[PDB]
Amino acid sequence: VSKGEELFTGVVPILVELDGDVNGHKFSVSGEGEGDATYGKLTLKLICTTGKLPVPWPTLVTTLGYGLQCFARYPDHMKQHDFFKSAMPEGYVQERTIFFKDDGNYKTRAEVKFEGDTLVNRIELKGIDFKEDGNILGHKLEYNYNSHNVYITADKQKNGIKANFKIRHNIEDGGVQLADHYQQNTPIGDGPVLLPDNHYLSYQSKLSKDPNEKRDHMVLLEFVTAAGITTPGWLSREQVFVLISAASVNLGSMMCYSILGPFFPKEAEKKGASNTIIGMIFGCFALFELLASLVFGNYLVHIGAKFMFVAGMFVSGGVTILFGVLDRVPDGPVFIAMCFLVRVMDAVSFAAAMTASSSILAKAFPNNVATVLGSLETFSGLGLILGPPVGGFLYQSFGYEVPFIVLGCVVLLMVPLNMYILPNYESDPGEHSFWKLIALPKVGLIAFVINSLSSCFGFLDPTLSLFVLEKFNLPAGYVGLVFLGMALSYAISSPLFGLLSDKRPPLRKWLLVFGNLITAGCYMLLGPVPILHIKSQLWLLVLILVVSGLSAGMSIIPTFPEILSCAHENGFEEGLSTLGLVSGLFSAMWSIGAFMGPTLGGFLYEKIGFEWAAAIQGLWALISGLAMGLFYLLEYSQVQLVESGGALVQPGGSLRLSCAASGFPVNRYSMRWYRQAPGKEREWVAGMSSAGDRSSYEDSVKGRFTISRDDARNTVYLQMNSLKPEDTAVYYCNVNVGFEYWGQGTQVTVS
After folding, report:
1. Which of 280, 396, 703, 731 is the most buried (most CB within 10 A)?
2. What DSSP line would sit under 175-231, residue for residue?
3. Which residue from 358, 346, 352 is spatially nearest to 295, judged by alpha carbons?
């Protein structure tokens, strides 16, 4: 707890200083930058104020980035344990002892102060016993940097923390240099101390050069995350306290939403609404809810979530009683400006509810994004299946009014109780264009899929009732429950294909494609041409509609994590505004499907029969699903490694291991081979340089291991002879192209 803790968020500009005396050589570096504690980024452009550096660049990165640890993104249960963020406006000091393996040493002292709004960093270091012909001063350090963990514990003897981290520097010969870092961090002031437990920090550092800076310089795009303590497995009551509200929002509305649909032919000719007017009801219900959801997703930050959400059903609590009785008055010169007062504010009532609710749902659970959406969907399905059987008494009470007062009282009494739930105040507006968000080709291709999936349901819903009268002849109340089977299958597909979509991320894309593919199948048997000579059996049509609902429910849910990852990976922000604009995107792309689908399908039904009228929508969805493979199966350039060749070993012998690559070429890159022993930490074994003329070997396997590379298939082989009983371990392959990427690794058991 501190006065500057709440002001620490947002951008905070940084001033960075450095003077240093390494091996009798004096130099100085100064620079500027900024970052965030909520985003976690840290961009620092450093320029040498002296000239040619007597040290390699990454050897200074560990004392210029890890010296600036005020910007640390901590998780929820770790927010108490912020010692670097404990007190900024006084300043703190950091003493680091840096050792190298069998080489010289660094000692540095760090003073950081906070004046006004900006942060000043002052570093001084002394470097002793370094050689010109060694690994360091020969400029043998490759201009890349890896990902390392920082292990922090606290001590109350000097009210501070002590930390350790070992850094692997890459070598142009191929090997690594181990930098031991011991940290003693204390605060200057006598203020309150926020003592951490045992925890660790994770880093992801970039290292690039801008050509427009003429002198010696570097650019850091460090990303720092935190972890360390296992969270309790129980669900917190504060997070239930919003999930109950979201469940009530999705549950109470759908009864009124489902009963207002077929209610309208009780008055459609009382109002004098001709087919042009009936058509413009659907036209307004499409386009006005497009515009409303779009402007809401644009201006969620400016309006704010509270009056967005708790009044989001107050207008729905108005439209549940707006149809109180409309057989009373002879709307004559009333109905000139009432046709957009019948169902348009119903549309913005349920567009304003779901756009906000999806955003506040997805904010609370980043680790379970698809699970809780599927949970609300299966709660919706359980509400929909048991929807109208409770009406067998109530609207026989005193007339035709009853479904719009008694349930209207429930909505009007449940609407003001949603005010306790939202504590959310404010975020930042989105800087990138929402048109630029759409103009990304990935959303530009999933848009057509989600419009097709909406068009399927929109065409099918007023079609089975007019179809099954002819060759099946079921009564009106029977027309419902087939459809209920579909809902049952959406329920079966609501969490089961959602929770799995949280487990394995890269499996979702093909899964989405698979959904679309089987969606094509589920209409080709729906209305078949009798060239296929299938008989209209009830059981086969029921089964193909159940697997239709299963496919639709399996394909609807992983749309939202896919577009979240699409917005995340392509350089947009990481916050509530991006989540809200993605939710409005989903709202608009769902709402346009009520206009693309039912119009042309209802036109072509009476024209060509519900065989080819179903077949045109089926082929439309089939082309919609087939379009996804052009962007997935042609640009599947995610970098990954495949390791194999490990099995049981007869002791004192010869075998081989291999690892192949995908996502990058090996024309200008090096590669490493690591080993994890049981119970002991990792250790560099082999290294193939970018040139490949030479290689680097561990001394314990020197003269025993042969590394080889085949450039055509991007395959790398490691062979040996006379294996040892200590060589029961798991081997990893490491590559460094804009991240430190590792493979899964495989086992060698010398038994």
Report:
1. 731
2. -EEEEEEEEEEEESS--------SEEEEEE---B--TT--SSEEEEEEEEEEE-SPP
3. 352
Structure tokens at 202: 């994770």
CA-derived radius of gyration, the chain: 32
List of domains in the chain = 12-227 (2.40.155.10), 234-426 (1.20.1250.20), 427-636 (1.20.1250.20), 640-750 (2.60.40.10)
- The structure was resolved to a resolution in Å of 4.0
First to last CA, the chain: 56
Q: Do residues 707 and 673 touch, judged by C-beta distance below 8 A?
A: yes
Tell me how far the alpha carbon of residue 216 is from its chain's centroid.
37
Residue 672, strand partner residues: 687, 734
How far is 315 from 345, CA to CA, in rounded Å? 7
Closest-CA residue to 461 (of 602, 286, 266, 250): 602
C-alpha 405, offset from chain centre: 42
31 contacts 47 by C-beta, under 8 angstroms: yes
Instruction: Compute the half-sphere exposure of residue 726: CA atoms within 13 Å on the CB side of its CA.
Output: 4
CA distance 403 to 321: 9
Nearest-angstrom CA–CA distance, 673 and 277:
72
- Chain centre to alpha carbon of residue 597: 30
Query: Is the Cβ–Cβ distance between 118 and 137 less than 8 Å?
Result: no
Distance CA 565, CA 576 (A): 14
Single out the residue of 671, 669, 647 nearest to residue 659, CA to CA: 671
**Structure determined via:** cryo-EM
**β-bridge pairing 683-688 and 41-48:** unpaired
Q: What 3-state DSSP class applies to 336?
A: helix
Strands 160-170 and 176-187: antiparallel
Q: Which of 673, 667, 687 lies closest to 641, judged by CA? A: 673
Within the chain, how many helices (H) and strands (E) appear? Answer: 21, 22
**Bridge partners (DSSP) listed for residue 715:** 660, 710
Distance CA 541, CA 539 (A): 6
What the block records as the tokens of 187 is 């605060």
Mark residue 645 as left, alpha or beta (left: phi above 0; alpha: psi -120 to 50; beta: remaining). Answer: left
In the sheet that 705-710 helps form, which strands lie side by side, from edge to edge?
Answer: 640-644, 656-662, 715-720, 705-710
Which residues are CB-neighbours of 635 under 8 A, at least 6 positions away?
none
- Distance separating alpha carbons of residues 388 and 627, to the nearest angstrom: 40
CA–CA distance, 204 with 224 (Å, rounded to integer) = 6
Q: Cβ atoms within 10 A of the Cβ of 14, count?
A: 21
Cβ pair 323, 404 in contact under 8 A = yes
| DSSP state letter for 526 | T
CA gap 560, 556 in Å, rounded: 8
User: Which residue is listed with tokens 């002892």?
Assistant: 97
Partners of 13 in beta bridges = 34
3-state secondary structure 653-699: CCCEEEEEEECCCCCCCCEEEEEECCCCCCEEEEEECCCCCCEEECH
With contact defined as beta carbons under 8 Å apart, do 199 and 226 qualify? yes
Burial bucket for residue 180 (CB in 10 Å: 0-12, 13-18, 19+): middle
Closest CA to 638 of 712, 741, 503, 733: 741
Rounded CA gap, 489 and 679, in Å? 48
